[PDB]
Subunit: 215 residues, 4 copies
């Protein structure tokens, strides 16, 4: 039988799943964390302890940015429409792209090009930068070039961690899913009603009323 799909990251056929060769429960038993599973499933590599400390902080820092932004607001709109959590969160996730979250992969991409082709106050940035430059020994050429914005900081850092270029948006997608789930729960706890924008929030730049011509 010719297979329909080819997978390289996980095997569910045994007693429990294997993530890049490692048993899920053995990762739990030996003290590994969510950040380690992220490394295994997205990069097929168990992160080093410093890499795991950076992944953890990137996800924590990126988890939510309030209810006003497109991802969270999409989830809220769906929550208020009575849609179930997974589907509501999927609507918020659909907002992630070139304008909402996209500054991470683009920063990473252009600062990598800058390092190769042109080699020669936000408290979260000052925290992240000081953590990676002082509490780790990770070589951060892209970040160092950028130092010579949180999306800029995170994007440079992920290119410097050698994560595949295809994986970079994953950090923002996963992290913001925590906030979007949270917003859905918050609206459900409040028993929020359907949202319908107020008329004065809309500029109805519409055609004048006209009668339909006969045919």
């Amino acid at each position: 039988v010719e297979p329909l799909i080819r997978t390289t990251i996980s095997d569910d056929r045994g007693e429990e799943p294997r993530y890049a060769g490692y048993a899920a429960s053995e990762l739990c038993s030996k003290g590994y964390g969510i950040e380690d599973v992220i490394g295994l499933l997205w990069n097929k590599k168990l992160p080093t302890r410093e890499e795991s400390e950076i992944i953890k902080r990137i996800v924590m820092i990126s988890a939510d940015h309030g209810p006003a932004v497109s991802g969270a607001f999409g989830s809220i709109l769906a929550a208020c429409a009575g849609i179930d959590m997974p589907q509501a969160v999927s609507a918020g996730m659909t907002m992630i792209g070139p304008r909402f979250g996209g500054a991470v992969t683009n920063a990473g991409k252009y600062f990598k090009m800058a390092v190769e082709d042109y080699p020669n106050p936000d408290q979260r940035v000052k925290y992240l930068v000081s953590y990676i430059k002082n509490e780790t020994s990770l070589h951060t050429p892209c970040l160092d070039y950028a130092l010579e914005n949180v999306d800029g900081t995170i994007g440079c850092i992920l290119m410097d961690l050698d994560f595949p270029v295809h994986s970079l948006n994953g950090f923002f997608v996963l992290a913001r899913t925590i906030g979007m789930i949270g917003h859905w729960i918050d609206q459900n706890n409040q028993n929020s009603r359907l949202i319908r924008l107020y008329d004065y929030l809309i500029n109805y730049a519409v055609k004048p009323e006209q009668e339909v011509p006969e045919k």
Copy 2:
């Protein structure tokens, strides 16, 4: 003219109007600096409370254990179909996530609800609980699996139960009840095991987590796997999928001529 504005939405969990975003009143930079993790942010945004150490260790294992279960299941396969169709990651994973529901992944909330109801209303009457569920609800949420069974046990379930019993002091009436239900249901049919959704739901009810939050633990964890599958197919440059003809049981109308109007 001006307008008297009434708020459109009300939010209690997060705010970005200050110096940096605040999660249930706490700054993310401070959470990072003081040694907290992803499991702590999950607790703040979903329960508005910093988890205890015992809770954080449980949340971490729930997420790790649930992260992925291969490419054959609806969530992963949906993400893979979209990846092969050349769809960008967030939109591809949204398609996979849309599969999460009563049958696949999204039975956590209702498993917690109904096992808690059973503990309260049928503590010494599992057959009463099962009969009530069959007549009034349908399949018992958190019971059953397409591939795991008495002969092919789910070590993810065995691990979470062993961890709770041995590495914590957590009192678990819902989980203990569900394990007694599993003995009764698996005597009827081997497929009627206590599954991962049922296990997680019971543990989270025993931790008194918000009832609405329960499915969130699966949704979030399995997003890790779905992103992983999208990346995997992109690394392989996988082509557009068309389901093979032999896998489709066609039972279609005969070819027929359109009649004149």
Copy 3:
């Protein structure tokens, strides 16, 4: 062993076949979009009367402005630079029990009410409150007895006066509306209720009912995406004065 079973369409022959009919031949013989809907959702070519009803349901339901959840979700995605299909998929995800997707249940319960509570609307309303919750097909955020929904009035008048359809479900729902609007003005028979009743009276498959709204409102959601793209609209961020920030006091993180 097969993975799925399918009965509605087949692309293995010379061209795709919809319930056994070739689309080129349906076009050539003067059939329309409404006939293809009937073939793919009911496996039968509609009668001329049925096709005229389907057409009108779709046209009447196509759009209801940018303020409503489906359109606003599509607009939010358009403004975020998301491509059309994925943006409209976000809008479509909003269609459910509160907005747009009460057609199926409205048809299901009004059809049962005709048989089980023929001369007892209070008994039906009591059964629903205990067994279901809000009556699907009743209520609206903006339309009411004081601001009637002319879409509902039009569809009801078209059916009752311009077709020969026997409408026990729709007639029952109209009697229900007299009872509920006497209690509260917002409890009108809404578009979802009207469509659901009409489709049950037409003996359409019960699972198909929400499809008429999902498809029709896809026209509108695509329109809003195109409109925002033509305007080169920017990323939307909800104004802070539209949000009641009932957030926890800013606190210092305690030591572990």
Copy 4:
């Protein structure tokens, strides 16, 4: 409190504030009463113009021909996967719709854009257009078919081209160029015919529909089929899909013990 409001959204296509919706200024029920159709509402909402009778006849045919292509293809299959997972219709169809993009449906808009570029840049130079495309794009979008060819024509294409040439007086420069391109490409290899995506994409550019709108015709038409498939699976009470193990090539890492931290 009172605020000086700036509108959050600007809309030009429809007004819902009155007794019924107004599509590009026209009352929805009056379009119904005066004998207009779905295709007329499509033109009003997507182009802000009531189509001419001939444009209306073309829109109708495009939608009908594009409505479904069987259950094996990504959009329908996504809807079927969600239907089998117990997901409600709108959410299930949304998953299938997510598959629509560069590989599935995208050849319509790509063919339109490039045959329009050829009419403008290579008006009487098909070899130059075909030389540039092979260098900067690869296979010409809208050209080629696996099973169809000169010996076995696509009757939908022959029907549509014949309709627009013999039942309308519409000027079709993009479609005319694509038919001249087909004469050159079919002479090289018989299978390089003008396909249905190429025929539709060219026609839409010739009807002067906005460039942003072209994908709408496939999206809306295939929503008919995706709804159909969801209903079909629900009528059957189909069970959850989980791909059989033999359909997966598990090109996975060797099993190893987790190292100590």
